[PDB]
Every structure is written in C-alpha cells, then in structure tokens.
Write an enzyme that holds these catalytic residues in place. Structure first.
Site, PDB file in Angstrom:
ATOM      1  N   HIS A  36     101.062 -12.992 116.249  1.00  0.00           N
ATOM      2  CA  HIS A  36      99.949 -13.000 117.223  1.00  0.00           C
ATOM      3  C   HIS A  36      99.287 -14.162 117.915  1.00  0.00           C
ATOM      4  CE1 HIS A  36      96.662 -13.255 114.152  1.00  0.00           C
ATOM      5  NE2 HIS A  36      96.013 -14.200 115.345  1.00  0.00           N
ATOM      6  N   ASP A  63     103.607  -9.124 111.965  1.00  0.00           N
ATOM      7  CA  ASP A  63     102.693 -10.189 112.507  1.00  0.00           C
ATOM      8  C   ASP A  63     103.140 -11.443 111.812  1.00  0.00           C
ATOM      9  OD1 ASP A  63     101.005 -11.646 113.727  1.00  0.00           O
ATOM     10  OD2 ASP A  63      99.142 -11.010 112.928  1.00  0.00           O
ATOM     11  N   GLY A 142      90.339 -18.343 114.579  1.00  0.00           N
ATOM     12  CA  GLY A 142      90.897 -19.616 114.277  1.00  0.00           C
ATOM     13  C   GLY A 142      91.780 -19.786 113.259  1.00  0.00           C
ATOM     14  N   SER A 144      93.815 -17.990 111.907  1.00  0.00           N
ATOM     15  CA  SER A 144      94.919 -17.068 112.086  1.00  0.00           C
ATOM     16  C   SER A 144      96.291 -17.903 111.813  1.00  0.00           C
ATOM     17  CB  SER A 144      94.891 -16.439 113.474  1.00  0.00           C
ATOM     18  OG  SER A 144      93.945 -15.214 113.435  1.00  0.00           O
ATOM     19  N   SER A 160      96.395 -12.947 109.211  1.00  0.00           N
ATOM     20  CA  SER A 160      96.795 -12.085 110.297  1.00  0.00           C
ATOM     21  C   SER A 160      95.437 -11.485 111.114  1.00  0.00           C
ATOM     22  CB  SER A 160      97.422 -10.956 109.750  1.00  0.00           C
ATOM     23  OG  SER A 160      97.803  -9.882 110.866  1.00  0.00           O
TER      24      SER A 160
END
Length: 199
Positions: A36, A63, A142, A144, A160
């Site tokens: 993502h 993801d 952030g 992620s 994720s």
C-alpha cells in the site's frame, strides 16, 4: 545512501513510509516493504535523493512490495533502533503467538510488544487484506512498510495497518487494546525471489 530497516522513505515526493528489510535479487539491490505504500513504478527517495522505484507490489488481498535500489547505494542487513544504533538481521524464522517482537518506523521510532494473533483479515478502505499477523507493539501513520523483527534478529514482516486513534497512532492506549498488523516477510521473499541481507 544507506538502506536500513525502519528509516523514512518518500513515494512520488508525496507520501511517507518506512523501509522493511534490505534484500538482494541476484546482483540487484532492493528492500521489501508494504504494497500500500506505492503503486508499481512509484519513485522512492531516501535521505534527499532518488534511490529506486517500486519494482512490484500486491495490495490489497496481500500487502507487500519491493523497491529496487540503484547500485550506487549501500544495503545494510539491520534495522535502526532510533537511538543511534542498529539491530542485526540474521534470518527470517517466524515467531509464535506470545513471542516478543519489535518494529521500527519513521513516526513512532522503535517499539516493542508481543505477537498476539495470526491469519487476521484487515478490512481496509481499499479492500480486504488476508493472512496478517497481529502484534501489540504500537505504531502510527508513516510507520507503514517498516520492519517487524525479534530482538535476536529474525525478520517477521512489514508494517501494514491497525487500529490507530484520532492522533494517528495507537501508542496512547495500552498494548492490550492494540491491533497492529504486519504482512509476513516469508511469502514476500518467496514470491519475488529475494534474499535477506544479514549481518
């Protein structure tokens, strides 16, 4: 520039995520992260400079992604501890529910907790992502794509999603109320034929 788990990178000069793990594919340098964080081809910058682009991605459903890194840059088989040091990465053995785990990312830095569930489905706005592992280390928008790993250096996965509160993180609630979901690293390495850089 140096590629290191947990550090900030920008996508299309617009959004932010955190490096998962340095990897190689033959002679090609790269790092794994969350799907993502960028569409295919999205331009990646670390430390004020272009380092590569999203080579491949799956999101939603999964993801996962990996960013191929230009040969001028250096890969480090480690994760930042956000206080001047690193934790060596030494393999990708998966830890069981209850085991201790930490994660590293650009918004909340280095945070620890426990693995609390496996094979969780997150019903994201973009669609379902299945098979996620849940821990109760906290995280924020952030973080992620960032590294999840045991203290002995076994890579678990890449950040994720989870139940961020209105301040954009779940660090303001106790661990027992937290749901922090990562994509297991094992299938990412397998799908794209990537090898962990270790140290």
């Amino acid at each position: 520039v140096n590629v290191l788990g947990g550090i900030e990178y920008s996508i299309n000069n617009a959004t932010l995520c955190s490096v998962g793990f340095s990897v190689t594919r033959g002679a090609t340098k790269g790092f794994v992260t969350a799907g993502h964080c960028g569409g295919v081809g999205a331009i990646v910058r670390i430390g004020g400079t272009q380092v590569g682009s999203f080579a491949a991605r799956v999101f939603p459903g999964n993801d996962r992604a990996w960013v191929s890194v230009g040969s001028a840059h250096t890969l480090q088989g480690a994760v930042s501890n956000y206080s001047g040091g690193t934790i060596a990465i030494r393999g990708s053995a998966e830890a069981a529910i209850g085991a201790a785990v930490c994660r590293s990312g650009r918004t909340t830095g280095y945070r620890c907790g426990n693995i609390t569930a496996k094979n969780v489905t997150a019903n994201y706005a973009e669609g379902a992502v299945r098979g996620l592992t849940q821990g109760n280390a906290c995280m924020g928008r952030g973080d992620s794509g960032g590294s999840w790993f045991t203290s002995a250096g076994q890579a678990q996965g890449v950040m994720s999603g989870g139940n961020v509160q209105s301040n954009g993180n779940n660090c303001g609630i106790p661990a027992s109320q937290r749901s922090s979901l990562f994509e297991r690293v094992g299938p990412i390495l397998s799908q794209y034929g990537l090898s962990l850089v270790t140290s």
